[PDB]
Design a protein around this ligand. Structure first.
Ligand code: PAM
Length: 277
């Protein structure tokens, strides 16, 4: 029996005609890129107060460890499919140490942009479409894709003077890794700074730049954790809530609905296509 893909996750979601998805403080737990298959949609980035029209030749890149606030609204008179490619941590590591030589200008890039737009050449459209076409690819060696994505992320970074793939000494990565190492623990802000051996200073900068309080950040990480659990095959809402560190199903559901603008059971239906029972 062939095995699940170790480098990527592919999830496709139906965007009904003229409907809107709205995300409020969603934590991006891994690097993600997404695109629509046909038609057009309006993307409103509420972090930057910038609006974009995307088409089938656009790809939107979401930075790991960012907190996103945006909406996506279908502009088409037909159902649209949103394809979300998650790049897994094992694979991103390979990318950090792949590109030959030292890129001299990258030290003067900045980290201000967490949502990036790229208008694809058909080269890119071909490769991305084949990746998501079927669970295995086979015709795409892992090395081919490592070369492709390191070159792909390189040119997006150069369009924006911005670091997309960060080093793993990043303070926000250390925080989110620590929280997820014990997701049901009642984390306190002073405990995290203590265990990371970094005072409540450079760490506070990470909350401020994302516009969240500590308790908001923990809730956002826990929602992203619950979505990861649902993707593993866990479909019992009580188990999803408790394993993600929520005190009750009621509160999980309220936070989930505030973050994703749909109820947990609705998201489960979008994910699996199976209505309950
Ligand atoms: C938060 C990233 C979603 C980007 C794509 C938005 C398009 C359709 C909304 C359905 C997806 C809802 C969140 C998906 C969760 C995930 O796959 O990580």
């Amino acid at each position: 029996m062939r095995e699940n893909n170790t480098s990527f996750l592919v999830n496709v979601y139906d965007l009904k005609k003229f409907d809107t998805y709205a995300f409020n403080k969603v934590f991006i737990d891994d690097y993600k890129i997404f695109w629509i298959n046909k038609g057009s949609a309006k993307l409103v980035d509420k972090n930057c107060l910038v609006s974009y029209t995307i088409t089938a030749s656009s790809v939107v890149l979401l930075k790991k460890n960012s907190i996103q606030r945006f909406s996506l609204m279908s502009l088409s008179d037909e159902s649209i499919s949103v394809c979300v490619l998650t790049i897994k941590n094992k694979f991103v590591n390979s990318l950090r140490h792949y590109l030959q030589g030292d890129l001299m200008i990258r030290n003067l890039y900045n980290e201000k942009k967490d949502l990036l737009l790229w208008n694809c050449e058909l080269n890119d459209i071909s490769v991305l479409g084949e990746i998501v076409s079927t669970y295995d690819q086979t015709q795409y060696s892992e090395d081919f894709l490592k070369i492709f994505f390191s070159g792909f992320f390189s040119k997006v970074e150069k369009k924006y003077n911005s670091i997309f793939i960060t080093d793993d000494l990043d303070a926000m990565e250390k925080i989110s890794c620590l929280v997820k190492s014990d997701i049901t623990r009642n984390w306190r802000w002073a405990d995290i700074c203590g265990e990371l051996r970094t005072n409540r200073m450079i760490l506070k900068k990470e909350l401020e730049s994302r516009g969240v309080k500590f308790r908001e950040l923990i809730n956002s990480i826990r929602i992203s954790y619950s979505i990861s659990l649902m993707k593993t095959g866990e479909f019992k809402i009580k188990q999803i809530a408790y394993q993600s560190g929520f005190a009750s199903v009621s509160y999980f559901s309220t936070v989930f609905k505030s973050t994703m603008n749909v109820a947990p059971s609705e998201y489960l239906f979008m994910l699996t296509g199976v209505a309950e029972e």
